[PDB]
Symmetry: C5
Subunit: 339 residues, 5 copies
């Protein structure tokens, strides 16, 4: 993602005007190629009109230019872009909040699974590693950056997320579907084993741990559902046909005709339409918003930083249930102590 | 569904322009017949205008064409399509998230119902099969693809979802309503029987299993509610009358009149209106979005893959509570082991 | 409600065009009287213009018709109808999901309240009957169809929902407010009595039953809140003044003036404006959507079927906690049994 | 509030047309003064134009009227009113659902706190009175009607909501912030005291009572948050500058000019513009919707009835935990008793 | 924030018109510099047109002014501002409700952690101080005002939120990420230690305390997610290019041309366009709404008062779990006591 939230905290004079001079993740980086194609086509048509055509051909081209200028209409294009980009942004933020965080399971496994010896330490680390693996196996299915980081399951083993005996048990389980649900079953079986051996005290603490497991499972299921069910293809083809029809009308209708014939609206020849190019930046950039956000797990400048998030979740989890189990600072009186 | 999420991960040059060359689930496959009817009517009217009519008849037709061209208005049609398609897409995604998944019940039944002998194995398998049956009995009511897969209850028996004694008990229960709530009562009675025989340890684990049962029941109730309560019929008839009135105005008002009489706006005869046909693709495709998504359990190219989802849920459930009960990999130290 | 969800499963050629030939719940049944009033007023003004008026009076009427045709403006009317109908449809679907279903309480009372003798049977039936009564007492307050079914509390007694001793206890309780909260207190007291006599085993099962009771109470409170707090009256009067002002402009501005005087836009006399009548069907039907859905508990063709839903809930509840208490089919091996 | 939900149940002929003849809470009562100011300014300008000005002054005024009529533009005003009123109505209904209801705590305190003697009776009444006080102390902060009912804390004591020893303990607690959180701490301490004395049986029932306490605390926190964080002032000033700029353009541009000079669009002198006044009612009433609903706890005709709701909550709570503790009707067989 | 909710309770005559005379947080304070730049550029171009240019240059400037006036189009600018400001306001209110409040943890820690001696007092104070620290460490990451209050962790120590031994333990924990999750692990370990020493009675009360801890952790995670994932930069650059293109068209197209040449629409020379400046206030202020609300934790007049909220939360928490532990008013009969 491109974070600029510290830049737009106050509403000063140059609040949003300073954001037009940025390159990374901007509208220019997304519209360079389309703008150069549009410039090339426009000045090609204009120079063919000025230099090649004969006089009757010029008259027919002027009539065609008036015909095409009658259909350059902005309002329904603005409608369909507004509703489509609203749908895309709603699904974008809805996909962000489905990314699973291990912290709620971390707080309970760090405290409730007892044992300051080796075995309870190993038990807590294995539980949080099973929680992180259940998230990595769905992020490598919904994202291309995580999939380029983990192309095979052996790359998941190399990273330390899965011991080779867990990989042998993982491949021995025979299922033709996506296997992101395997560690979230291993977690619950290990938690019940830990209770039956005497590490978890009562049933209530075990059921709290299992409820947070099911919450993380529902998060992974939401990510799977957003990846598997896209925005419909016809509703994307409608907005592209609309925007490209508007720009095809503006390629011909927005020419500068001959002023000696005095057409209404064509009394001046400027050789370069500034406002047509600004309308191009407006409409084509407001389509590129929806092009960028339709899959936020890719590799754009403003797609989600998911590899960083995997690294954070693994380090924080194994830090909090190993180095922070019953390791508290000394209970002292605070500054607001009355008596 | 038609998945193209891997294709639109990055915002390259040909991001959405490559989606216009696709056929399966596209706008062309949904607009072929309407477009051919529109082409036939338009060129019929145009050739009758050019070849059959006399001169005074030609003058009356030109006056009628100016009258009909005065009413080809795009802005309220774009309004009503925008709001209606927003409603349809909101209900579409709301119906996806109501499809029940057995995984939250699966995690708890795989671990908490004890017994490595035959009886506890049979008990866990019967519990997850009662959870899957409560979902299949509502998917064969809300969907046409699941109903063509399971036309009678005997087809549900053949698939292994229901033993014949369960079918005899199912038909002995006399109720004139939809019976999708029967296995979700059998589940809770079998869970309480399993607790009273000594398989489930405490009351807390039993109540956690029953809470996940009630969550799956609420999912099935949401699917029943979305199928039974449609979008109102008058609010669909409004958008169809609007779009067909616009196209009836464009059949006559968008003719190419005789240029020798020099009507304002009709100075050139091109024999084929490109921009009228592009406006047809835009408006008729933005109506076909709402036609396709108004019942996402049918048999379109972008309706929900529900038979696959039933097969997945059954295989994953019976795999996780039978082959994975207290079958864990060997507890080893991970790569991040400090001491 | 008018269900057509099986008709619009696929996006065929005649998907929505077949819905224009339906009568029950359609736009025609809602716009018959307004359309006949509009036709009568329009042709009255037109025939007075053609037959009664003198020539200077004709000239003044033509000037008035041009003045009124200058104000027939469609875009803000389409704005205010779009936002108002969006609010109405949002509240409509929000009121559907607040209707209470007894099934979550049914699953727990069918299993956890023990006793295969007469007393436990009577206890379970009394609990589910107290759950259904707490829903009927709010549906007869928010709906007119349920109120015509149950005009007095004696009609609730006749239907079997309330024994006469419960009616005596119900009328002995002195409160000047709506008494839909009485059976939801009787439920919790009977559940605690059932626990203290030895029927409910532990505290956890009792608290699960009471939590589902409070969920059904929150559902009834939502229905009470949606009925008591309407859409504001000024926001309905705005959209009616807007639509009726547009149609008052179209009564006079859309006349066919005399072609011999050659007004711009009035060069042809057709005697019947097709597109004005189609704009009438569009705008008046898109107002009738909001007229129909503003109270979905009435007696329209697409209001909620609430009497059927009460009958279903009562039959399913008393069936599941009496005939299905510890009455399970024989535990057999399924078809996917491995060993 | 103005309830008309029983009036608009069916979609008859006079469904919404009968709502235009109502006065209480209507558009007329909110637009009387603005409409009279607009009428006075308009006819003042018109009579100064007709009677006072000389001929060259008349020519300059006609040029100014054409200039101002060129800027009376309706579409962006309709945009900004639509989005702003959508925000106001969304926050309005969101503030209704945050009003706390004591019924979920009432069901649990009526049943779980044991004791048919004096002490348990006093304990249950004190618990529900602490629940109601925690709601009254935030309704007298967010509302002006509740604040006029309870101007000081002594008026809260007079009403019986707070005994004078509770007022002494309430004022002894020294905090410079709003003290609506004090009775919601007293509730939890009294509940734990009641458990430790033997009135509440187990820990599970105590934790259920405390969870419903925290739910009511979150409701009060939502009301505090909606009152403290208003809609931004600049986003209200934008819509008022837009609507008043449109009406300032219509004061001068919508004059009836001299017909003898034959301006295009001013060929008739009617002395009173009907459609300009109807556009005034439309736009000014669609602003008065947002003016009325921006604080729904005031004293408009369609603000929330909060004093009634406080009276209801207090009477229902003290009725249900005192007169209805273990006072059940006699368990009889219902009408659907099979055997 | 700027609170005016007490001012707009009723819908009087001067309800919103009195808000146009306010300065703090208004549209004037946000548009002063842009308005002066626009005034300077406009009157510079106008005086260069009136005094410097020759006659043929005047003719070319009039042609250029007609060309630029043909592109001053308001409707798509109003579209894109409406949808963008709707997104900004939705995220604004969504970020308000993610601010964590300690009151739900406060109610349970004040009652369930036993001990009226020194040790239980210190235990309850340390628990609520760990809850407040977990909120301060994320507010100093998402806000600039809290970060200017707490620039280093030593400033957090000075304020009494963290004792120096807790700071030594906090810096000994080695993690390269944001450490706002450390006190929410210390809380759960101290709660389990308090249960194992005999202060918390059962497992159910401990699990309720831990569930409210996880709820506050999810609140802090939501604030972190809204700060880290901004609105996309291209979707802000689109709306700024649109608004600045409209104002660049209005700088030249809205000039007052020479009336002696009698251009259509330029028949009068007023020297100052009132309606162009009002359209500037409308569009530029409706952009400044989105400029102000895009980061509501900054230092605008209508950003969130977060330092006050931190002070309130700390004082209320340490007041309620120290001075209010088992300190109840005397149980007296209320005014509604029957017998
Ligand atoms: Ca992307
Ligand atoms: Ca379909
Ligand atoms: Ca109705
Ligand atoms: Ca108000
Ligand atoms: Ca700000």
């Amino acid at each position: 993602t491109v974070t600029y939230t510290n830049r737009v905290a106050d509403a000063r004079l140059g609040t949003f005007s300073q954001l037009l001079l940025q390159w990374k993740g901007s509208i220019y980086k997304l519209l360079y190629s389309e703008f150069l194609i549009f410039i090339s086509l426009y000045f090609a048509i204009s120079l063919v009109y000025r230099l090649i055509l004969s006089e009757s051909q010029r008259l027919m081209f002027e009539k065609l230019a008036l015909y095409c200028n009658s259909y350059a209409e902005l309002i329904p294009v603005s409608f369909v872009l507004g509703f489509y980009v609203s749908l895309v942004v709603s699904r974008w933020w809805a996909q962000y909040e489905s990314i699973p965080w291990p912290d709620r399971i971390m707080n309970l496994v760090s405290c409730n699974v007892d044992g300051e010896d080796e075995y309870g330490r190993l038990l807590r680390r294995t539980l949080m590693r099973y929680s992180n693996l259940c998230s990595v196996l769905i992020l490598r299915s919904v994202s291309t950056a995580v999939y380029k980081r983990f192309p095979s399951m052996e790359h998941v083993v190399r990273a330390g997320l899965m011991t080779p005996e867990e990989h042998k048990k993982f491949e021995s389980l025979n299922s033709p579907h996506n296997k992101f649900w395997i560690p979230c079953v291993w977690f619950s079986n290990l938690a019940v084993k830990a209770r039956n051996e005497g590490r978890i005290r009562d049933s209530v603490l075990l059921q709290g741990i299992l409820n947070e497991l099911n919450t993380l499972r529902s998060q992974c299921g939401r990510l799977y559902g957003y990846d598997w069910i896209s925005i419909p293809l016809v509703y994307t083809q409608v907005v592209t046909v609309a925007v490209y029809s508007f720009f095809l009308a503006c390629l011909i209708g927005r020419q500068f005709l001959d002023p000696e014939k005095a057409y209404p609206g064509h009394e001046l020849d400027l050789f370069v339409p500034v406002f047509t190019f600004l309308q191009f930046f407006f409409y084509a950039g407001w389509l590129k918003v929806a092009e960028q956000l339709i899959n936020p797990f890719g590799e754009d400048d403003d797609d989600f930083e998911t590899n960083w998030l995997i690294d954070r979740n693994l380090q924080v989890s194994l830090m909090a249930v190993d180095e922070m189990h019953q390791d508290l600072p000394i209970l002292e009186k605070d500054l607001y102590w009355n008596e």
